[PDB]
Design a protein around this nucleic acid. Sequence first.
DNA 1: ATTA
DNA 2: ATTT
Lengths: 170, 170
Amino acid sequence: VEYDVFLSFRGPDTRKQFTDFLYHFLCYYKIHTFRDDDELRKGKEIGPNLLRAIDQSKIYVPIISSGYADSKWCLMELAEIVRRQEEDPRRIILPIFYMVDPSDVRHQTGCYKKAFRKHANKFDGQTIQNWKDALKKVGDLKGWHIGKDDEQGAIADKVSADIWSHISKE
Amino acid sequence: VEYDVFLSFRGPDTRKQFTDFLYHFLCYYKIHTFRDDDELRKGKEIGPNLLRAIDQSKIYVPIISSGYADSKWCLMELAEIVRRQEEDPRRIILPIFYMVDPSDVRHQTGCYKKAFRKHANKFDGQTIQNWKDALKKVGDLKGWHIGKDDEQGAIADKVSADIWSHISKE
DNA sequence: ATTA
DNA sequence: ATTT
Ligand SMILES: Nc1ncnc2c1ncn2[C@@H]1O[C@H](CO)[C@H]2OP(=O)(O)O[C@H]21
Ligand SMILES: Nc1ncnc2c1ncn2[C@@H]1O[C@H](CO)[C@H]2OP(=O)(O)O[C@H]21
């Protein structure tokens, strides 16, 4: 009755081509999947919406993209996934990289440098270190890379069963 | 050596055509003027910078443009002038309207209704009440109107004398 | 409406 | 390059 899978993604980059091609496919395997479309902004961290599904979910599946470093809601929300993970390691994380290399995620260089070049003029001098030391550890787990050739269809089918297999076999 | 005039204007609307046309002319009347160029943002209200120049000035001249209520910094900056005025009524205000009618600013209608249509989704429901009641009072005092035809070179000189006349005679 |  |  509660949520079992919680997603997360960029705003406009991958909201209507691959993320959607997954959520529909997942519902055809009978598992209630939670994704949110309201941009929040009504504060700094809303209550019984995001913060509800975070502690209720089971298998966090963050979909890092190429511009995932700009929207200040995304990072400081991901800093809550990996922080809640280190408390109880019973739940897992299955990142799915996208277009970008799996080397510009462990050092925030390359396509992210312009992002943290302007985020350092507004926020604290230590909060930024709280994002990087949390964004880095995500780039060390397992994950399906998707180059410019891989057919963005079977990857969805191959990655749905790997999420359903942790439900039937328990 | 302290400030005697403090301005405030919309950003990319009236920064490089009329305000600078006026700021130089004031500098040829030997009166030290203060305008700020950095976008600030670094916090909620900077300490010994903007909030210092308010108490040091003497003749506030807020230049209400056409979309002066969209930039979230401007309003809560202007709400600071009219409050400092009522506590120690030694200083004055000489607003200079621009494009906008003086009847679409005493009721927030028209080109401003679109601005206050979305601020109810982001900020607190009471802070808006204090701006709506502070933006109205400014639109009651004196003020040179400048339509679409008035020679903006003539009003600059005419508005220079009215500022200097309040200094020599003490 | 959107920018966001 | 802003800017939420
Ligand atoms: N303007 C927005 N820009 C970028 N991401 C957004 C925006 N609004 C919502 N999201 C994302 O919806 C997701 C629901 O869990 C959540 O994941 P996120 O990456 O923290 O960023 C949010
Ligand atoms: N990007 C900007 N957006 C809106 N207002 C700006 C911007 N940059 C400067 N200002 C305004 O410069 C003024 C300095 O006294 C200050 O008054 P303001 O009305 O708070 O709006 C500022």
